[PDB]
Design a protein around this ligand. Structure first.
Ligand code: 34D
Ligand code: 34D
Ligand code: K
Ligand code: K
Lengths: 458, 457
């Protein structure tokens, strides 16, 4: 099926207030037309992010009642450890409170100053920790990834030629590690093929270079492999996931993404010595290696969730729900990043509002309009989030001016997707009526978080 | 009352396996006679730590069903924010996944390399982050705090003269901040008086020096003030807590201690510019400032728990339950660190086992024997935990060779305390039979965590 029904029932609901348009407009204005300043209680469908917003199962909530909150030797730790060892195949695991905790550990252990880290694009926290520990980041993603309109498979693949060029120019000993992300966020949630992981592994093995996965949406990635990589159609998600990680030396994981939980993460590695070093380092940043900044009950929920994520029908429905939204928008001519990724649809607000300039903040304004029209919250990922240039004092002006419709796992229905799509399509049909915004309050940093705007009038 | 009844009922119970002695001995040996290696399922009464092991209330669990897991604007965040603003009085709050997360932020923001941080003793993670950011730690606790046998009030107090001396010798500009801990862990959980907090504030204000509290057991501290500081007998715990923090510029808090939760912490501060800088920095270590590495449900549970902790009868019982254990041991002649602190009783293993040299690891062996006798787990806090001297390859030899009996909040009863005490007392009457330990496996780091031993013969 192009669009299968939910492979589960609703056990419990989260009630919402269902406020009318006049009230939404009032709340949007109070939030300075910045969706980051909206109160959760005033949002009907919250597509700000797929991180930590997932609906857990009855089995996970049963696990939540069996939290073994002991500082050492918790049953929940042992369940998590054996689950990750079984499903990912790594020798050692260190729990962390979420993904960027594991990144702090990995980069603190695996990077000497002056070295390079190469990856298929980047994520903000991941890159921060790499650079904080002395590394220069090199993008080695394939060129197609930077063409937002280009519909091609496995857009997230590393260009092996760029990797070969790097090794020759910089020398293997100067490369801390390859950071292979699955899926690739900055490209719109694009997958990486098994063939690509193999080729990166083979080349790195030649030169003694380590590969560490940024694995936050690895199950979504496994689904794309199963659906689209020749030869994998009859291989289980579980076997695809296990094979994927067989080509890595370790990984950083955010449970908040594909482990179907609201908090949690971990660091995996095969190397005994690195594991020992990670154990003493985790103590001062996260907590003892036996809980790593997580309650027992959350290690349990993450262990259960990761195993739940392996179910074909679940991840098929997850990805096809996102696809449904994207295809409905595409059918109406709405400009989106293509192909649709695993976890989100990205609107190109620049092309949605051709009558505006980027300096009138079309992404920020389109996000405001979407909320006022529907009660749906989306995230500005454009000029506002990019922040100001510290030297010039002018805006950074990023090439991507987008509104991100980010889909939590197992929270919404196709009817919610229809509500979102219908509102956006209505706005698109009258796009010329979307007004530009200007600052009325700008913080000196993290401006996307608390900035306030009002409309430009002529 | 000397020992009041629990000011609550049991809502739900946690299953334990009631395994016999022969089986406990088997499990202890499988754990290499290291209690840190015992599985939780094999422990009856787990006194390894009071951190994150607390029992929550029905109200907190109701809150756990109302987790608003939004990335921004969570109802749970706003609840936590106004609760901490109301009860602690600080202008700004940044959630963190627990205490050491807040410490990372504070030390990253408030320390220039080459500066000093002075405090009343220290805790490992707190000091690490201070030194990592280029500070030199200076102990300015009163001398009495280092006399483990001396029974005096407010042993945790800062010695104002030591602080005056530090300011004169180093200069105010070279002191990043004063780190005032409540209670003081290394002295056995000893409180700080309101009078002391005032004097420190007064002196620091004269020189423009910032004071940040390490406030993980601030409610236990407030109880000691109410109970023992002249003039506070009829002041509420809530009002004592609020006044305590009125003498601080901010704090690092572990909810896992006195906020009655299993995970959670936060950073507070009054300064706008520091807050703005903190909001930027928390994003890459913990998470967005609107959740700070916590699920919404945990921000909610911590908000509720902190308010519950203000109930006089609750914190009175908490502290008096620990005291009950300590006094029962004292009444049988068992040697402990004195006076008894708010959250734990420390056995003096050196005097418990005078027939053993420190090289035979008496604290480690005593902890093993306690488990085998009762099913009670305690923590070695002695030569093993001290680690091996890197330079000379010999043990670090700490003056304190102790076994820590750390009491989680609202988890155990007086009957459990009796079981603990009765077992230790029986061991004490036959102490000569406690055998020394030796390594069979020693890690090169964190040796207390995974080391394995067997008996000398
Ligand atoms: O795009 C996001 O959802 C996002 C979320 C964060 O907590 C930090 C960041 O740099 C980006
Ligand atoms: O004494 C403790 O319980 C303790 C706990 C920790 O997570 C670190 C540490 O250095 C000490
Ligand atoms: K969450
Ligand atoms: K815990």
């Amino acid at each position: 099926m192009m669009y299968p029904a939910e492979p589960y029932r609703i056990k419990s609901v989260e009630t919402v207030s269902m406020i009318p348009r006049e009230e939404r407009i009032k709340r949007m204005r109070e939030a300075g037309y910045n969706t980051f300043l909206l109160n959760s209680k005033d949002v009907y469908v919250d597509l700000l992010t797929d991180s930590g917003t997932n609906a857990m199962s009855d089995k996970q909530w049963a696990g939540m009642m069996m939290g073994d909150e002991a500082y050492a030797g918790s049953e929940n730790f042992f369940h998590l450890e054996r689950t990750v060892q079984e499903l990912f195949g790594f020798k050692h695991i260190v729990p962390t409170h979420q993904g960027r905790g594991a990144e702090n550990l990995l980069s603190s252990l695996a990077i000497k100053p002056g070295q390079y880290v190469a990856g298929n694009m980047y994520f903000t926290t991941t890159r921060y920790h790499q650079e904080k520990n002395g590394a220069t980041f090199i993008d080695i993603v394939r060129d197609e990834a930077h063409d937002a309109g280009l519909d091609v498979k496995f857009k997230g693949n590393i260009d092996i030629k760029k990797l070969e060029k790097l090794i020759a120019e910089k020398g293997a000993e100067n490369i801390a590690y390859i950071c292979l992300a699955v899926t690739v966020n900055l490209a719109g949630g694009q997958p990486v093929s098994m063939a690509n992981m193999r080729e990166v592994r083979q080349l790195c093995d030649k030169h003694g270079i380590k590969v560490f996965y940024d694995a936050t949406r690895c199950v979504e990635n496994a689904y794309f492999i199963k659906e689209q990589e020749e030869g994998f159609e009859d291989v289980s998600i579980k076997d695809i996931v296990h094979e994927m990680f067989s080509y890595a030396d370790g990984c950083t994981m955010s449970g908040k993404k594909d482990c179907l939980v609201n908090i949690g993460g971990f660091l995996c590695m095969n190397d005994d010595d690195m594991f020992s070093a990670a154990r003493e380092l985790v103590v001062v940043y996260e907590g003892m290696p036996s809980y790593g900044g997580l309650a027992g009950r959350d290690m349990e929920a993450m262990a259960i969730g990761l195993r739940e994520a392996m179910q074909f029908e679940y991840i098929e429905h997850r990805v096809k729900q996102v696809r449904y939204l994207g295809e409905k928008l595409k059918a109406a001519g709405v400009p989106i990043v293509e192909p649709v990724g695993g976890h989100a649809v990205f609107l190109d607000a620049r092309r949605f509002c051709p009558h505006l300039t980027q300096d009138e903040f079309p992404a920020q304004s389109l996000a405001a309009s979407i909320y006022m029209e529907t009660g749906v919250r989306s995230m500005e990922r454009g000029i506002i989030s990019a922040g100001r240039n510290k030297e010039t004092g002018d805006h950074h002006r990023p090439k991507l001016e987008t509104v991100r419709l980010t889909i939590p796992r197992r929270v919404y229905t196709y009817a919610h997707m229809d509500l979102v799509a219908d509102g956006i399509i209505k706005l698109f049909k009258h796009k010329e009526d979307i007004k530009g915004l200007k600052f009325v309050y700008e913080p000196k940093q993290l401006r996307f978080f608390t900035a306030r705007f009002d409309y430009v009038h002529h």
